[PDB]
Amino acid sequence: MQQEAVAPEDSAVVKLATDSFNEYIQSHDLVLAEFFAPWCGHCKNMAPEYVKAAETLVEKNITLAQIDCTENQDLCMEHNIPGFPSLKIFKNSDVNNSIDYEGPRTAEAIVQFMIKQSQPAVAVVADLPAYLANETFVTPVIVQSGKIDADFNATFYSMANKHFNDYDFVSAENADDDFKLSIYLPSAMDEPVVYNGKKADIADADVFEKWLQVEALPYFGEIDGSVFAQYVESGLPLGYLFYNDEEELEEYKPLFTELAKKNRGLMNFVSIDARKFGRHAGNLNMKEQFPLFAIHDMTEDLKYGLPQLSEEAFDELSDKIVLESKAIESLVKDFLKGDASPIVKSQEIFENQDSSVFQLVGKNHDEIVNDPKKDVLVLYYAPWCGHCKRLAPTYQELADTYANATSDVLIAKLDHTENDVRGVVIEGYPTIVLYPGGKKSESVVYQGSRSLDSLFDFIKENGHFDVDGKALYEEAQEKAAEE
Ligand SMILES: [Ba+2]
Numbered sequence: 001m002q003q004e005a006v007a008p009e010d011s012a013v014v015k016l017a018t019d020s021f022n023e024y025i026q027s028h029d030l031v032l033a034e035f036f037a038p039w040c041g042h043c044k045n046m047a048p049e050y051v052k053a054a055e056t057l058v059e060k061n062i063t064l065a066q067i068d069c070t071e072n073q074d075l076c077m078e079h080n081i082p083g084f085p086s087l088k089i090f091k092n093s094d095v096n097n098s099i100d101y102e103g104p105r106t107a108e109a110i111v112q113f114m115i116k117q118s119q120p121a122v123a124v125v126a127d128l129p130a131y132l133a134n135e136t137f138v139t140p141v142i143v144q145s146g147k148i149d150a151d152f153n154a155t156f157y158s159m160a161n162k163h164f165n166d167y168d169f170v171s172a173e174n175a176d177d178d179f180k181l182s183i184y185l186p187s188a189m190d191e192p193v194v195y196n197g198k199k200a201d202i203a204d205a206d207v208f209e210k211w212l213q214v215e216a217l218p219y220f221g222e223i224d225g226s227v228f229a230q231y232v233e234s235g236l237p238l239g240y241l242f243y244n245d246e247e248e249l250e251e252y253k254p255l256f257t258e259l260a261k262k263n264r265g266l267m268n269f270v271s272i273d274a275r276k277f278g279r280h281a282g283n284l285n286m287k288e289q290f291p292l293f294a295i296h297d298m299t300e301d302l303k304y305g306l307p308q309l310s311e312e313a314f315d316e317l318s319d320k321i322v323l324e325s326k327a328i329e330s331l332v333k334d335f336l337k338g339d340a341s342p343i344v345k346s347q348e349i350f351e352n353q354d355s356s357v358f359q360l361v362g363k364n365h366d367e368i369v370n371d372p373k374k375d376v377l378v379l380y381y382a383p384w385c386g387h388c389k390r391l392a393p394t395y396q397e398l399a400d401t402y403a404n405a406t407s408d409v410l411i412a413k414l415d416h417t418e419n420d421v422r423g424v425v426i427e428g429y430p431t432i433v434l435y436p437g438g439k440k441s442e443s444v445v446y447q448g449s450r451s452l453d454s455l456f457d458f459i460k461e462n463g464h465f466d467v468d469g470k471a472l473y474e475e476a477q478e479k480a481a482e483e
Contacts, residue, residue, distance in 0.1 A: 003044050003045075003047060003048065004038065004044060004047060005036050005037070005038050005040055005043035005044045005046075005047055005085075006036070006038060006047070006066065006068065007047055007050060007051045007054070007066055008051065011051050011054060011055070012051070012054035012055045012057070012058050012064065013050065013051055013054045013064050013065070013066055014063055014064065014065040014066070015065070015066055016033065016065040016066065016067050017067065017068075017071065017072050017075070018072045018074050018075045021067065021072075021075055021095070022095055024063075024065070025090045025093060025094070025095045026093045026094065026095065027093065028063050028093065029091070029092060029093050030061075030062045030063070030089070030090075030091060030114070030117060030118055031062075031063045031064075031065055031089070031090045032062070032063065032064045032065070032087060032088070032089055032101065032110070032114055033064075033065045033066075033067060033087070033088045033089075033090060033098075034050060034064070034065065034066045034067070034085050034086070034087055035067045035069050035076055035079065035081045035084065035085065035086040035087075035088065036066060036067070036068060036069065036084050036085045036086075037068065037069050037070050037084045038068065038070065039070075040084040040085065042084070042085060042105075043084050043085045045105075046085060046105040049105055049106050049107040049110065050064060050066075050105075050107075050110070052107040053107040053108075053110040053111050053114075056107065056111050057111055057114060060114075060115065060118065062114050062115075062118065069081060069084065079098070085105070086100070087100065087101035087105075088100060088101070089101060089114075089117055091117065099164075099165070101113060102225075102226065103226055113165075116165070117164075121157065121160040121161050121164050121169060122156070122157060122160045122169045122170065122171050123168070123169070123170045123171070124170075124171050124173075125170060125171070125172050126172065126173075126174075128143070128145065128170070128172040131170060131172075132184060132189060137168060137184070137186050137189070138186060139166065139167050139168055139186070140166075140167045140168070140183050140184065140185055140186070140216040140217070140218070141167065141168045141169075141170060141183070141184040141189075142156075142159070142160075142163075142167050142168070142169045142170070142181075142182075142183055142212070142216065143169075143170040143171075143172060143180075143181070143182045143183075143184065143192070144156050144170075144171050144172070144173075144179075144180070144181055145171075145172040145173065145174060145177065145179070145180045145181075145182065146173070146174050146175075146177035146178050146179040146180050147174070147175050147176075147177065147178065147179050148171070148173055148179060149179070149203070151203045152179075152181075152199070152202065152203040153171075154203075155202075155203045155204075155205050155208055156169070156171070156181075158205060159205065159208055159209075159212075163212070166216075166230070167183075167212075167216055179197075179199060180194055180195070181194070181195040181202060182194045182195070183212075183215050183216050185216075185218055185219060186218060186221075187218060187219060187220070187257065188219070193215050195211060195215075213230075213233050213234050213235070214234050214235075214236070214264075214265065215264075217230065217231065217234060217268060219256075219257050219260035219261055219264065219269070220253060220256045220257045220260050220269050220270070220271060221270060221271070222270065222271050222272070222273070223240070223270035223271070223272050224276075224277075231268055231270065232298060234268060235299070236266065236267050236268055237266075237267040237268070237295055237296065237297045237298070237299075237335070238267065238268050238269075238270060238295065238296045238298065239256075239259075239267060239268065239269040239270070239293065239294070239295050239332070240269075240270055240271075240272050240280075240284065240292075240293070240294050240295075240296070241256060241269070241270070241271050241272065241291060241292075241293055241323075242272050242273075242274045242277070242278070242280075242281060242286075242290045242291055242292045242293075242294075243271055243272070243273065243274060243290065243291050244273075244274040244275060244290045244291065245275075248291060248320075249271055252271070252291070252323070253271075255325055255328065255329075256269045256271070259328070259329070259332055263332070263336065266336055267295070267332075267335075267336070274288075274290040274291070278290065281294070284296055284303050284305065285303050285305075285343045285344075285345040285420065286303075286305045286308065286343070287308045287309070287311065287314070289308050289309060289314050289321060290321065291321060291322075291323055292305060292306065292308065292321075292323070293305060293306050293323050293327075293328050293331065294306075295331070295332075295335050302342040303342055303343050304331065304335055304340050304341070304342055304343060305331075305343055306323060306327055306328070306331055309321075344362050344363070344420045345362055345418070345419060345420040346361045346362035346363035346418075346419050346420070347361040347362075347363075347415070347418045347419055348361070349361050349363055349364050355396065355399065356396070356399035356400050356402065356403035356411065357395060357396060357399045357411055357412065357413055358410055358411065358412035358413070359412070359413055359414075360378065360412050360413065360414040360419070361414065361418075361419050362414070362418075362419035362420045362421055363419075365378075365414060365419070365421055366422075368410070368412065369412070369435045370435065370438055371410075371438065372437050372438035372439065373408075374408075374409070374410055374435060374436070374437065374464075375408060375409045375410070375434065375435075375436050375437075375459055375463035375464055375465050375467060376409075376410040376411075376412060376434065376435040376436075377398075377409070377410070377411045377412065377432065377433075377434055377435075377455075377459065378412045378413065378414060378432070378433050378434075378435065379391070379395060379412070379413040379414070379430055379431075379432050380413075380414055380416045380421070380424070380426070380429060380430065380431040380432070380433070381413060381414070381415060381416065381417075381429045381430055381431075382415065382416060382417040382429050383415065383417065384417065385429045385430070387429065387430055388429050388430045390450075391430055391450050394450060394451070394452050394455070395411065395413070395450075397452065398411055398452060398455055398456070398469070399411035401456075401469055401472060401473050401476065402467070402469065402472075404476060405472050405475070405476070406465075406467060406472070408465040408467050409459060409463070409465070409467050409469075416429065416431075423442070424442075424445075426445065430450065431445070432445070432446040432450075432455075433445050433446065434446060434458065434459065434462055434463065436462060436463050436464040437464040440464050444458075444462045446458050452473075453470060455469075456468075456469035456470045456473065457469075457470060
């Protein structure tokens, strides 16, 4: 048959239900539970890999279970299941400590993650250099060492537990040395980042958290879903190097590792695989032309990057693209100074056609919307949007009402899907803002039905020129009656 989400009932996988779950978790110390619905295609896509991991994992006295939520709603509510599939790890035979699996749903990724969960949250050692030399680490290593006080120790363990799948935690206690808290980063293992001893402070878990959010990031690692939130959680701008092959990345690693060490505290730098993630470039409003270097200020949502080819030039490009070191270096220091121009996404300005409705792009938006001789209505839209299309004939008859009788009003539309705009970012579409004047507040976002009269009255009531479009509409109608 075609592949189903439920595992074959004779496999290593264990079927768990409302009345059997608790007894099962609390007699088994490490359990991966899949909360699924049979109608779910991603649940079907992963079943073969789930079974293949469950097999590989019997060996280790670690269970993989399945709960079908369409039959176990009580259970799915109790575990707060948001969607399918949901993979939860129950540890220590306790149905109240679970964590989410968020990694690749492949057999190999699932067995690796589950074996890790059997390992202690803290490595308790005396010989620390042996420990650090023996393992090739892929994540930062958080080490407490020296004379460790009880209060800090509790915080440390609590963090080891909370951050179990983010960092490795080591306790190298030595009552003859001064306390240290250190981070070892994978590229610079012979050179820890040591906390700056407000020691009473660092046993506060918030102080501890904030320190980690910034300091416990590779200087120049690879970004992806598993780790993106960590870069966002630092609170700091993100530099992206898009690369299209590992040999090409290897050319940029030394410069970006230096730039990263230099500006650690100020921004981050990540490598990002163009083959896997080229798409993301438009998200940074860059062209998909790699390698590329861009900076995203996430807090401000401004985007910056190094100039690229026009799409014409690029399509006649017989050469590898190179980013010059100096241009990269230049943009970084400019960005961090405040000198550096964000990139604004825009369609080509329209040659424009016989509509009274002005079609704006991100390029020409401000000039026109700002102009003090106005009252400017802008409809922000997407063509992916029924309601915006619904409105079209109303928006057109509103534009015609004014075009006929006055120049004191501009009625305009911008496709937000294809054009950045600043200061006016309501989530959905349609969104409508009225710009009355360059010595007038904008704070006139429209709420209401998009009815013609609501819109006429809006412009009338909140417009600098008090243009009474209703009256004016009534006029046209009588004059059309040859009157
Ligand atoms: Ba002791």
